[PDB]
Design a protein around this ligand. Structure first.
Ligand SMILES: O=C(Cn1cncn1)c1cccc(F)c1
Lengths: 300, 237
């Protein structure tokens, strides 16, 4: 179990850790979060009480270093930093753990939600989508645009998701125009899986990371990427059986976790109705179709 | 974006464009089988690709052999249309290639866009106009060449005959659509109008009769009467 200490909490803020969140008051004696499970990536995120604009946060893996949060009064936000001095970090953490000024990551023992949302998400891949190579952790916020969004303006602060475009030469083989547009299996299996992602775990990991950024930061381009990667599978006649089974589980847990009140903006009516009711894989996502029909029958 | 009544004069400017109509590509007769079921028999079709400024018509004849052994023919017809339009553009010299292609039915947009990915600078546009190009098969010489074809074939026409010697492209296109709208609303009456007077002939190298200017006004007036009427006969007014 690992710990992300906080130097202090000088501004009132809602702090998220993975799917949990809690309110900290201005200058409350809050010194961080303890008992964070090892073996998973995590996201610690923020929404200032004064400015609900800009949710922002940091993806990290405690196996990659000792990280802590301190407020920066010049840039006006809680920044993740790394403590290089291990002994110093141990002492600062133990003292705060003794004074009980930390919240405990509140995982219920039965609960596999976070694992199921992050099963294929790896910190090394996150760091390639979010390019800032001097830090081991990755900052995301509501307003960052994707590489594909910029092609349609600061390249350093972008989300470099894999570009997927159904009406592109990459997607459409000369002489197979109709075939490849109506059945995307070529594009899915040869171009993306074999060519770009190398395997379906890396594909699913980017899909999961895009959903999480859409849900935690309301990041619009992430939401586009999540739906694009779903649609590319649902619109492929030929998908490995294991990939369909795993996708159904992935989507099921995303749909389960989505706040009921955010469905109107984070779910694309067209993509979902196509995937569940029209596409090649309309009969292949049983768990996802059941939760969608019972939780958001309005969208459909 | 879309083509409508507001940007209608764009059609006659000096940017090469083409209208593409796919309504006569996949054509069928519906009939009963010996067992009393229903079946279709395809008949030859055509793509109607028209330069509205010049009158040049690229009539790609769609021979029924192209449907043999194929499924979902209405969907395939849109892709076959787009393949043939793309092949046409590629056959043209660069300075003759269109800068825009306007499709008369929105279902053609994605098929054409995909087939024209090699031409990112050619804008593919829909239109809000209800253009009557489906009536092209009421022009006898066009129907004749489609029905006689025994193989895929492209035939070139000037759908304006020699009118551009005397009138502008805007007027020529208005006359064309009036004639076609008439032929679409009541083909018999429209054809009666065009041919009642046997002293006005169709030149061997033309599609429509050799009317004088004054005769064209009389003709155009009768076609508008027909269209307004049939609109009464239809709505009882
Ligand atoms: O580096 C620091 C504190 N500091 C060092 N130089 C300037 N500020 C640190 C490390 C670990 C946990 C924590 F709360 C603070």
């Amino acid at each position: 179990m690992n710990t992300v200490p906080f130097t202090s909490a000088p501004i009132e803020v809602t702090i998220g850790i993975d799917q949990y969140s809690f309110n900290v008051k201005e200058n409350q004696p809050f010194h961080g979060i303890k008992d964070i499970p090892i073996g998973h990536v995590h996201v610690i995120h923020f929404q200032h009480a004064d400015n609900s604009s800009m949710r922002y946060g940091y993806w990290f893996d405690c196996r990659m270093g000792n990280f802590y949060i301190q407020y920066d009064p010049k840039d006006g936000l809680y920044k993740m930093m790394e403590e290089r001095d291990g002994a110093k970090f141990e002492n600062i953490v133990h003292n705060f753990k003794e004074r009980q000024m930390m919240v405990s990551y509140p995982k219920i023992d039965e609960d596999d939600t976070w694992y199921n949302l992050t099963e294929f998400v790896q910190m090394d891949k996150i760091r390639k989508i979010v390019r800032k190579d001097e830090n081991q952790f990755s900052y995301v916020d509501s307003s960052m645009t994707t590489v594909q969004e910029n092609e349609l303006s600061d390249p350093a602060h972008s989300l470099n998701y894999t570009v997927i475009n159904f009406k592109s030469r990459e997607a459409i083989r000369p002489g197979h125009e109709m075939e490849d547009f109506l059945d995307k299996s070529y594009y899915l299996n040869t171009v993306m899986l074999q060519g770009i992602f190398k395997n379906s775990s890396n594909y699913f990991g980017e899909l999961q990371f895009a959903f999480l950024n859409a849900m935690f930061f309301g990041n619009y381009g992430s939401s586009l990427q999540w739906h694009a990667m779903i649609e590319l599978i649902c619109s492929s006649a030929t998908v490995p059986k294991h990939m369909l089974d795993k996708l159904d589980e992935i989507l099921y847990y995303q749909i389960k976790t989505l706040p009921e009140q955010y469905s109107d903006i984070l779910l694309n009516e067209r993509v979902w109705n196509i995937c569940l009711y029209s596409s090649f894989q309309k009969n292949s996502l049983h768990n996802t179709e059941k939760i969608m029909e019972n939780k958001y029958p309005e969208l459909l | 974006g879309a083509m409508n009544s507001s940007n209608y004069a764009e059609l006659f400017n000096n940017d090469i464009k083409l209208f593409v109509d796919d309504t006569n590509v996949y054509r069928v007769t519906v009939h009963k089988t010996f067992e009393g079921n229903v079946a279709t028999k395809a008949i030859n079709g055509c793509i109607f690709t028209l330069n509205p400024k010049t009158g040049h018509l690229f009539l790609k004849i769609i021979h029924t052999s192209v449907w043999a052994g194929q499924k979902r023919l209405s969907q395939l017809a849109k892709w076959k249309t787009a393949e043939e339009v793309s092949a046409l553009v590629r056959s043209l010299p660069k300075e003759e290639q269109p800068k825009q292609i306007i499709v008369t039915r929105k279902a053609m947009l994605d098929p054409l866009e995909v087939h024209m990915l090699d031409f990112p600078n050619i804008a593919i546009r829909p239109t809000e106009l209800r253009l009557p190009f489906s009536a092209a098969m009421s022009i006898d010489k066009l129907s004749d060449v489609v029905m006689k074809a025994t193989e895929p074939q492209m035939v070139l026409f000037n759908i304006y005959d020699d009118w551009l010697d005397r009138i502008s492209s805007y007027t020529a296109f208005s006359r064309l659509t009036l004639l076609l709208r008439a032929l679409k609303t009541n083909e018999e009456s429209a054809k009666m109008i065009l041919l009642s007077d046997p002293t006005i002939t169709i030149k061997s190298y033309h599609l429509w009769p050799s009317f004088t200017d004054e005769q064209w006004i009389t003709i155009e007036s009768q076609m508008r009467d027909l269209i307004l009427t049939e609109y009464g006969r239809k709505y009882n007014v």
